[PDB]
Design an enzyme around this catalytic site. Structure first.
Site, PDB file in Angstrom:
ATOM      1  CB  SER A   1      -0.851  -0.129   1.193  1.00 23.67           C
ATOM      2  OG  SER A   1      -1.699  -1.183   1.468  1.00 23.67           O
ATOM      3  CG  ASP A  73       9.081  -8.884  15.157  1.00 21.77           C
ATOM      4  OD1 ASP A  73       7.960  -9.251  15.539  1.00 21.77           O
ATOM      5  OD2 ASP A  73      10.256  -9.519  15.023  1.00 21.77           O
ATOM      6  CB  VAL A  75       4.007 -11.753  15.629  1.00 21.65           C
ATOM      7  CG1 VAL A  75       3.548 -13.326  15.781  1.00 21.65           C
ATOM      8  CG2 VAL A  75       2.675 -11.087  15.275  1.00 21.65           C
ATOM      9  N   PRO A 205      14.273 -10.909  18.193  1.00 21.12           N
ATOM     10  CG  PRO A 205      13.881  -8.845  17.007  1.00 21.12           C
ATOM     11  CD  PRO A 205      14.857  -9.416  17.845  1.00 21.12           C
ATOM     12  CG  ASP A 252       9.303 -12.309  12.420  1.00 22.49           C
ATOM     13  OD1 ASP A 252       8.895 -12.748  11.656  1.00 22.49           O
ATOM     14  OD2 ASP A 252       8.624 -12.413  13.836  1.00 22.49           O
TER      15      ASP A 252
HETATM   16  O1  LIG Z   1      -0.371  -2.660   3.360  1.00 18.66           O
HETATM   17  C1  LIG Z   1      -1.228  -3.309   3.049  1.00 18.66           C
HETATM   18  O2  LIG Z   1      -0.908  -4.590   3.082  1.00 18.66           O
HETATM   19  C2  LIG Z   1      -2.686  -3.572   3.452  1.00 18.66           C
HETATM   20  C3  LIG Z   1      -3.265  -2.282   4.312  1.00 18.66           C
HETATM   21  C4  LIG Z   1      -3.371  -1.108   4.140  1.00 18.66           C
HETATM   22  C5  LIG Z   1      -3.868  -0.264   5.127  1.00 18.66           C
HETATM   23  C6  LIG Z   1      -4.069  -0.661   6.317  1.00 18.66           C
HETATM   24  C7  LIG Z   1      -3.852  -2.106   6.630  1.00 18.66           C
HETATM   25  C8  LIG Z   1      -3.313  -3.010   5.611  1.00 18.66           C
HETATM   26 CA   LIG Z   2       8.977 -11.453  16.110  1.00 20.17          CA
END
Ligand SMILES: O=C(O)Cc1ccccc1
Ligand SMILES: [Ca+2]
Lengths: 557, 206
Positions: A1, A73, A75, A205, A252
């Site tokens: 995006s 990151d 997660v 991480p 990550d």
């Molecule tokens: O960038 C992305 O993969 C899609 C996205 C755009 C705006 C908010 C969350 C996800």
């Molecule tokens: Ca991680």
């Protein structure tokens, strides 16, 4: 995006311009939903994915907002210690703690139902099992337990009337998302929002950690730590899934890197090319970036150096000259299926060969496959998402940058051989491959253009419409699934703000029982294709003057 | 009128909702969504809750299982139960609004039932706040903010250390999957600020 926000210092005939192109893939009916809300403290217009209560893309007449994925990151994976003697338990802080578990039954149309158990630890839901070592992995999200708060933050932020009120809400959005801000006074802002873990010292991480307790997060980092900027000296805010801030660590994911090679540079270049941009010029950046080959800029210097000494009659030489004369902006031929210039095909074949010769070669199987993609790979239906510089290419870029790269080259991807030799060897592969298919006259090479498909299956791979409702567009465009632009204080309007968006195929996905498609089933499809846009209304007077229908409901809760 | 909800659609069919309070406002929102995108939202609901196999059969059993294994319903329900009355009104109003139209649809399907429902062999059921919340959780949180490959990462690192040795293998890992790269183009210029936090790039957790 992608997203670019132009502030007072760079806006022409306006005080601020926000152009957002969230890239979710393409679907029929539209991924996002147009909606205006007026009442209960809200006065907004825009569009939003799956019609969430909160508009991810829109404005309220005073400020506007947008998003792109953050790719921070947030997660980590904890390796839980299990015991065959204590099923359903795991060792945490010296004790055997009972896992949470629940029974689920999958009912199946024309099939037999299946029951299974889902398991969860204090670190999160269990991925699988590995009872040889008696281990199971739990996925820990920093936003765990903050799902609803994030949904609500995205809703309440719509009522903000300044940077302070808006950031108050951004602080409550826990997913890793870049949020963007602009207002009627020409102020612009950016926040890499999200909950991020405060990890124990020494916690890498990028790799799992023991779940036995000593490596548990200390908590979450404060909002103060979230990268943010209000009215940057540069006069603009641009993002295309690139790094928020110097020294900020990326997701990550092994296939995701923030390095010297980054497609956001294509946006920066266009914004910095002109001191000021008008709304129309800001919008035109969509067209340009959506057609821009993202690898040309990265590798042309390397290609030029390697071929600088070759005679004019050397084909590898002429391939590079072809690229040197090219601006990298793909355009369809009149056949509506091939590109005017063969540059992308050349770069594709060359880069594929380069990666095979370098990164792929230095990485043990089967991991080597992670770094073999050129980023051009696609099917007849075209890319399912944005086009980007592949992880392998970003690594190759650091390598061809030599000492100019801040990344120590622990292993020489060219393995002792002169980079020129490898580059030329890949150009030889490229000339053989391409000349075999297209002949020896490059000037008449008509290479296949990428197409674009609004898919009838949603991103899960699940039907959200009948197969026949799939829509097709000849020209692939590396652009937002939708594009919306907000222009604050435009000097040529009687309004404090103007806004536009495009929601293709159209606002409605309705088809009556007899197959009759809704009047707004496909009325933005051609608009999307030609980079058009339609006005978003906010004021009661604008909405009224453009009313097509009205319906009043009287209901009591 | 406090019970009044006005819906005005513009020349592209885009709805604008006018209502006095939270519940009525999002009731209007949910209502128009049910009019415009009922099948899409129904299938999005099944996608986010792993109930696709229910209508599409065995080919989606693995999908449904993977969805359910990736979240914890009761936790989501607890968050909803903890919402203030105002915030609850957003989700409740939204669901109630969808149900208002869905009821009309199921009262006169011969005219209002989206064709896809006939085609796919089932009919739409009512929504609850949980359903509305999960559209967001399952399509924004669980899929755009739930990315990790640490297990694979460690496998790569392990392989690298076996090929190149411990120290060089670790160094090549930092070459292929660096923690940070100071040359990365940033949305925020360096003159503005930099991220304070620094991490260990040696996997000291072992
Ligand atoms: O960038 C992305 O993969 C899609 C996205 C755009 C705006 C908010 C969350 C996800
Ligand atoms: Ca991680």
């Amino acid at each position: 995006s992608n997203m670019w926000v132009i502030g007072k210092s760079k806006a022409q005939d306006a005080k601020a311009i926000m152009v957002n192109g969230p890239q979710f893939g393409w679907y029929a009916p539209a991924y996002t939903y147009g909606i205006g809300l007026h009442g209960a403290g809200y006065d907004v217009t825009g569009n939003t994915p799956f019609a969430y209560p909160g508009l991810v893309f829109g404005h309220n007449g005073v400020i506007s907002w947008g998003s792109t994925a953050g790719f921070g990151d947030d997660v980590d994976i904890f390796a839980e210690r299990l015991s065959a003697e204590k099923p359903g338990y795991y060792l945490h802080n010296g004790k055997w703690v009972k896992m949470l578990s629940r029974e689920e039954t999958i009912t199946v149309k024309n099939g037999q139902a299946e029951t299974f158990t889902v398991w969860r630890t204090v670190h999160g839901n269990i991925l699988q099992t590995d009872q040889t070592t008696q281990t199971a992995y739990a996925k820990s999200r920093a936003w765990d337990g903050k799902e609803l708060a994030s949904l609500l933050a995205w809703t309440h932020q719509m009522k903000a009337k300044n940077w302070q009120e808006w950031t108050q809400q951004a602080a409550k959005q826990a997913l890793t998302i870049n949020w963007y801000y602009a207002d009627v006074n020409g102020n612009i802002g950016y926040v890499h929002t999200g909950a991020y873990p405060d990890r124990q010292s020494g916690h890498d991480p990028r790799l799992p950690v023991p779940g036995t307790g000593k490596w548990d997060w200390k908590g979450l980092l404060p909002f103060e730590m979230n990268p943010k900027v209000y009215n940057p000296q540069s006069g603009y805010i641009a993002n295309w899934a690139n790094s928020p801030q110097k020294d900020y660590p990326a997701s990550d994911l092994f296939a995701f890197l923030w390095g010297g090679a980054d497609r956001v540079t294509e946006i920066d270049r266009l914004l910095e090319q002109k001191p000021r941009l008008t709304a129309d010029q800001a919008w035109d950046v969509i067209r340009q970036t959506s057609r821009q080959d993202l690898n040309l800029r990265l590798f042309l210097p390397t290609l030029q150096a390697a071929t600088s000494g070759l005679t004019q009659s050397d084909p590898r030489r002429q391939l590079v000259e072809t690229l040197t004369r090219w601006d990298g902006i793909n355009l369809l031929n009149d056949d509506g299926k091939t590109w005017q210039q063969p540059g992308s095909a050349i770069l594709n074949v060359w880069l594929t060969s380069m990666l095979k010769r370098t990164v792929v070669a230095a990485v043990p199987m089967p991991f080597d496959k992670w770094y073999s993609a050129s980023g051009y790979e696609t099917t007849q239906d075209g890319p399912t998402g944005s086009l980007n510089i592949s992880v392998g290419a970003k690594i190759l870029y650091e390598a061809v940058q030599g000492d100019k790269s801040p990344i120590p080259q622990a292993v020489d991807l060219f393995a002792g051989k002169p980079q020129q030799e490898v580059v030329l060897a890949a150009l030889e592969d490229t000339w053989e491959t391409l000349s075999k298919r297209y002949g020896n006259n490059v000037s008449n090479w008509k290479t296949p253009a990428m197409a674009l498909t609004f898919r009838a299956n949603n991103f899960f791979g699940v039907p959200q419409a009948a197969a026949e409702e799939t829509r097709h567009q000849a020209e692939y465009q590396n652009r937002g699934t939708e594009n919306d632009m907000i222009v604050f204080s435009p000097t040529t309007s009687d309004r404090p703000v103007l806004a536009w968006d495009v929601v293709a195929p159209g606002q409605s996905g309705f088809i009556a029982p007899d197959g009759t498609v809704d009047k707004h089933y496909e009325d933005q499809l051609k608009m999307y294709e030609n980079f058009g846009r339609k006005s978003l209304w906010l004021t009661k007077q604008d909405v009224e003057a453009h009313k097509e229908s009205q319906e009043v409901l009287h209901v009591q809760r | 009128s406090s019970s009044e909800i006005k819906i005005v659609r513009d020349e592209y069919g885009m709805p604008h909702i006018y209502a006095n309070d939270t519940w009525h406002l999002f009731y209007g929102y949910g209502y128009v969504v049910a009019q415009d995108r009922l099948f899409q939202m129904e299938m999005a609901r099944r996608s986010t809750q792993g109930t696709v196999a229910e209508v599409l059969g065995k080919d989606f059993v693995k999908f449904d299982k993977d969805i359910r294994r990736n979240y914890w319903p009761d936790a989501i329900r607890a968050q909803i139960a903890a919402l203030s009355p105002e915030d609850m009104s957003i989700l409740q109003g939204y669901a109630d609004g969808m149900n208002a139209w869905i009821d009309k649809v199921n009262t006169n399907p011969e005219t209002l039932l989206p064709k896809q429902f006939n085609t796919f062999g089932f009919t739409p059921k009512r929504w609850e706040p949980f359903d509305v919340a999960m559209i967001f959780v399952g399509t924004m949180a669980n899929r755009f903010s739930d990315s990790t490959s640490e297990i694979d990462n460690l496998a790569l690192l392990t392989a690298l250390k076996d090929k190149y040795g411990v120290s060089q293998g670790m160094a090549v890992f930092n070459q292929l999957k660096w923690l940070v790269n100071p040359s990365a183009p940033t949305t925020i210029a360096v003159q503005e600020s930099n991220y304070p936090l620094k991490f260990n790039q040696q996997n000291s957790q072992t």
